[PDB]
Ligand SMILES: NS(=O)(=O)c1c(F)c(F)c(S(=O)(=O)CCO)c(NCc2ccccc2)c1F
Ligand SMILES: NS(=O)(=O)c1c(F)c(F)c(S(=O)(=O)CCO)c(NCc2ccccc2)c1F
């Protein structure tokens with residue numbers, strides 16, 4: 032099936048998902064000098080006070096924390112968005128080395144990892160239907176650099192040994208995603224896509240300028256995950272990032288400076 036290897040990785044995805052060569056694919060390189068400051072963009076409103084995390088899962092590509100999104104508990108609005116977007120899950124992409132792992136790049140710089148908080152537009156009723164709409168999803172992207180530890184990440188890191196292989200899940204309640212955010216909500220935004228199959232062109236990307244710092248030990252724990260299922264040949268889950276795709280006819284807007 033699709034993956035990140037030589038034989039099934041990003042360069043092969045277009046054969047099953049022809050939109051891979053589409054006009055609004057993600058991620059992209061954010062050229063900070065070319066991004067246009069838009070004084071009409073609003074501050075992003077991240078309202079995560081009543082978030083209800085449920086479960087953490089290794090899906091063979093990444094790991095994801097899923098949330099109760101059956102009410103307006105953890106929502107994103109404002110910024111470039113019209114309407115209200117409910118948090119459904121977050122996941123990460125990361126490298127085999129600290130100098131790679133992010134999907135977006137900033138002036139061609141790669142970060143060690145990228146956190147994606149995936150939200151869906153409530154006007155479409157459910158995340159599946161939202162993913163079929165051009166304004167269906169909003170993904171808040173946060174870069175991770177290696178330096179000091181991020182305390183709010185540790186609860187995630189410490190459960191990963193229990194979901195080592197594809198298809199493993201664990202209960203993961205009372206996790207507060209506010210502990211994964213940087214101080215500033217200054218961002219770049221552009222219209223794009225899922226960065227994994229099926230690569231739907233349904234995402235308003237909101238990429239925060241300020242990275243979070245995580246420790247080497249934290250990111251080392253991500254790299255102990257396996258792409259393979261229990262009792263198949265071991266392939267460490269590393270380098271689960273799609274490279275930057277052509278910007279084509281898009282402008283990246285900045286909320287700042
Ligand atoms: N992400 S979590 O459920 O594991 C957790 C922590 F473990 C944690 F240590 C923190 S902490 O680093 O801020 C210090 C003790 O509270 C937060 N923080 C959530 C938060 C962040 C900013 C403003 C309000 C809440 C936090 F959410
Ligand atoms: N990077 S990204 O945020 O575009 C991303 C993924 F990398 C990713 F793996 C996923 S997934 O694990 O759910 C695999 C499917 O692409 C989603 N999910 C987007 C989504 C969530 C709910 C309903 C429909 C799409 C997803 F949005």
Ligand SMILES: [Zn+2]
Nearest residue numbers: 122124147226
């Ligand atoms: Zn992602």
